[PDB]
Nucleic acid binder design. Structure first.
Lengths: 117, 201, 205, 199, 205, 117, 107
RNA sequence: ACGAGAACACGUAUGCCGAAGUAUAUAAAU
């Protein structure tokens, strides 16, 4: 996939990023992701426990609140199909897909941090 | 181990018969030439050997068959070549070979086994600087040197890079490591450094 | 040649910050990718403190030659002396109860706390983020004690007792003077895994 | 060798905002989800004020070399001279009695204070928000003093006592100027824990 | 004449540092580029500890002569009273199950633990980095015990069982006192590979 | 492509290398490349597994992130043509070319370590 | 040879060893050159059956010999952890005389 | 009826032994 690099390069507009998005504006998001991630790591089976599915909904709630609070985060999440991805994750409930999600989001962060003021 | 050095005069067939053409080939004169060669090969061979842990096994005619300690054998062989080049006034030359053989070997089998380039370049230049460096930096045991040997023996460029990095991990003075690296780059100087270090052990 | 095993539990009073792996993360394991306190830190801290407790000269401060009883406890074998350590400190692991309780309360193990380094004659407070383990978490530890000589176990155990108490009113980890690293020891147990030595009158608190 | 414990309790007097986590929240203890005072804050307010009360040369400011009494009291080793921190300030947490009283009297743990912005020549009202910790609450803290010289303990303790008074009069945390940061100390207790020192 | 096979796996509780290649790596197999535990390591540590178990004289220590039973187990054949060795300790190979496991969960085989050191009178830090085999990885080991005397079989097995226990509580490799390399054994097994000698009543914990 | 391997000596300036590049900020890259090298050693055939390819994707992501974090490393990666060769390796999906790349990286790294303050 | 050249694997490993003096606890470094793991050697045995009525017996014996070696070592340090070998792809053919070899078996 | 014939470059020992990812620096000026 790595459609992330395409989105970030397309958003290099005039030197603004998604209309001025910054990595420190993502912090809690990634933090939350990382938490789930390590929990996700400790589990063995691919079937994700109901508590983890509730935590996935909690991660989506965080994303929605952050998008509502900051307009630039909203644009980023909207274009990046982040909410579609999360919904599809919730539908799938499979660990491997979740790990793929983690990688994609981390790539997003890395590419964005690649082009910053 | 023991060292064995065997040497022969190269131009002795011509010297004994043709020697000096057309004007000094008197019977007495070639006799005196023979006499000098004999007296040298039977007296100087006694005298010069004083400082070397060597036993004289066969000396005479044009055959030199010497055995002793490897380092001592090499050193005395160098000494003998230089002394000969003095006494022959650089007119007669010798070909000599040294082989290292394990102790208690049947010598009847050792015998059948058996210059300035060697003296000035290898022993005089590379050997001394390598010795000084290994004097200055300890712990550099046969492990470190043996890794060097492995690096050199596989003549490939990636191995050149490996040798560079390994040298970097040492703590030898930059000049010493750079000299080893520069010597490794040159095929002739690498072969010479390899020989020097093989002597090092 | 018997071996006395010591088990116990590290309860983290304030934040704990090893920071071995580093923007600069703490030591976090690999099979469970849960943070652990590498023993090397534990042994070093306990050793430095116990050395301070006994005498320590500037010439002694030169090259880490320390008081002889401590030396017998931890081993130097440096001045051509035959000294293998009789007390080995292992690593600590995020014990299961901790993970369980935190999961059933949905709490992270690790916090990021942000600091503002103020510059004099500049009035600029620069933000530096430090990651530290959350409070109330626990690890389990095992120490191994070796009896090289019979009539010295009690004397070495007295030195251990002092060093264990020293760790409870000190900081273990990084930069404790900014208030991170306070720990405690609980549920001490002593057993002799191998041998015929009695460890019942023996106690650590 | 000897270690000196200090047990005591801070009471908050004016609204208090440290707000490390920054609608601009305050620091919180994650196992309790409750306010704390990150003892780093104590250390910093402390050292800054003490430098202020002692000599603070402009060159000394630029070079961050602090007064020798200050530097020795808290350890710096930034000028090359090895110096170990002689006092550690740890964090602090809510008191059991404080939390019990809050629950009994239904006292909120945090207050949101509106900060209205008024501009001259326009007087355009744009409220801002900020959070404060409930005033009057008390935290239990610890100061651990280490003895490195049996003759320096008295002088170091004298400096600590005067500094405690300075911290009480001044403001701790951010927005000290607007009325956030006045705390008091109570129930100081002194007791050496390790060693044979007389206190 | 019988040869007795012992099989099982070695589980790394805390990181392992065999590290014969010397930054400061671990020994690796050259066909797979994976960690190994050379049988010299295991065999020597077993001999060392089991010898220390029994009484060893100062002269015996200097001449490496040990107790008659440990020697008969391990062989000296150095002077005079020669004894042909009896238990051949094979190497250890990074088992397939753990390789697949790490691949599936995307786990490194080996970590680079960063460590530090505070020299005295300077308090100045000089860092180091050390490679450690990731914990929980499993090695396969094979021991082959030979019966040079039928009468003594359970006694020899009991001796090596004590050495196995000693290894479990202690450590292999380096950093043992600093925390590295405490190991455990799992799924041991015995089966007579050559001869006509039963091995059912045999056991190694 | 070996000119990019001996260019490291061409980048020895005054007295910093690659504008102050140190192996302390490049150790992560060495570990990640070595981890994938052992997986390639386990692989027997030439045609790379798709999960291995995604591993390459993650590798390049790490490359971009590391370039973003540090400037001297960014200069190294760009001035040595790291990204094009990475993409090329991904394109070729051959083990042997991958080993070639690893050797190239190793030469770069080692030569870099030779020159350091 | 072809596999190693392709995979760029050295043929021979240099193992670092160490020995500990007791009552001194000093370190003495050692170096042993070992052949690489996994290499294969092509071996040839020749058995001249001088007695038709014994060859079966002999092969049984040779079988046992091979079998023992399967769980034992060759060369030095075999107690210390090197030299275990394995036998694969053994084929037996008659090359002199007219004696059948379709029933002789060695693993 | 081959300067032959028999003959394991074997047996002992491992990478140790000590090192603390450490040293100050307010989530800040409305």
């Amino acid at each position: 996939m790595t459609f992330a690099h395409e989105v970030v390069k397309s958003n290099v507009k005039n030197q603004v990023l998604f209309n001025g998005l910054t990595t420190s504006k993502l912090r809690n998001l990634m933090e939350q992701v990382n938490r789930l991630y390590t929990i996700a790591f400790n589990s063995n089976e691919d079937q994700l426990n109901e508590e983890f599915i509730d935590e996935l909904e909690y991660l989506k709630i965080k994303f929605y609140y952050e998008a509502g609070r900051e307009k630039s985060v909203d644009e980023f999440l909207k274009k990046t199909l982040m909410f579609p991805i999360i919904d599809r994750v919730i539908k799938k409930e499979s660990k491997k897909f979740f790990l793929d999600y983690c990688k994609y989001f981390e790539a997003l962060v890395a590419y964005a941090k690649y082009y910053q003021k | 181990r023991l060292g064995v050095v065997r040497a022969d005069i190269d131009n002795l067939g011509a010297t004994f018969i043709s020697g000096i053409p057309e004007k000094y080939n008197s019977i007495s004169r070639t006799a005196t030439l023979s006499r000098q060669l004999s007296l040298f090969f039977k007296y100087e061979l006694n005298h010069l050997l004083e400082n070397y842990q060597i036993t004289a096994i066969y000396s005479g005619g044009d055959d030199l068959f010497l055995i002793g300690a490897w380092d001592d054998i090499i050193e005395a062989s160098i000494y003998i070549n230089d002394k000969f080049k003095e006494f022959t006034l650089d007119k007669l030359t010798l070909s000599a070979g040294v082989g290292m053989f394990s102790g208690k070997y049947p010598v009847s089998k050792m015998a059948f086994e058996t210059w300035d380039e060697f003296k000035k370049n290898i022993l005089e230049e590379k050997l001394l600087v390598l010795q000084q460096g290994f004097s200055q930096t300890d712990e550099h045991g046969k492990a470190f040197i043996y890794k060097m040997l492995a690096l050199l023996r596989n003549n490939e460029a990636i191995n050149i890079a490996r040798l560079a990095y390994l040298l970097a991990r040492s703590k030898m003075n930059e000049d010493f490591t750079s000299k080893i690296f520069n010597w490794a780059q040159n095929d002739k100087d690498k072969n010479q450094l390899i020989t020097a270090l093989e002597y090092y052990i | 040649y018997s071996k006395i095993k010591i088990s116990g539990t590290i309860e983290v009073v304030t934040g704990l910050h090893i920071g071995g792996g580093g923007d600069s993360p703490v030591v976090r394991d690999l099979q469970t990718k849960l943070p652990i306190i590498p023993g090397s830190s534990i042994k070093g801290k306990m050793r430095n403190l116990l050395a301070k407790h006994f005498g320590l000269k500037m010439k002694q401060e030169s090259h880490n030659q320390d008081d002889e009883r401590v030396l017998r406890l931890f081993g130097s074998s440096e001045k051509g002396n035959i000294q293998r350590a009789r007390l080995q400190i292992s690593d600590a692991f995020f014990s299961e109860k901790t993970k369980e309780h935190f999961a059933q309360n949905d709490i992270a193990y690790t916090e990021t706390k942000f600091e503002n380094t103020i510059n004099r004659l500049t009035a600029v407070a620069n933000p530096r983020q430090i990651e530290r383990v959350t409070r109330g978490s626990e690890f389990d530890f095992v120490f191994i004690y070796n009896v090289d000589e019979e009539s010295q176990v009690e004397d070495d155990f007295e030195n251990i007792e002092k060093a264990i108490h020293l760790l409870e009113n000190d900081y273990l980890g990084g930069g404790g003077t900014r208030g991170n690293g306070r720990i405690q020891f609980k549920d001490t147990n002593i057993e002799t895994v191998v041998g015929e030595y009695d460890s019942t009158n023996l106690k650590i608190k």
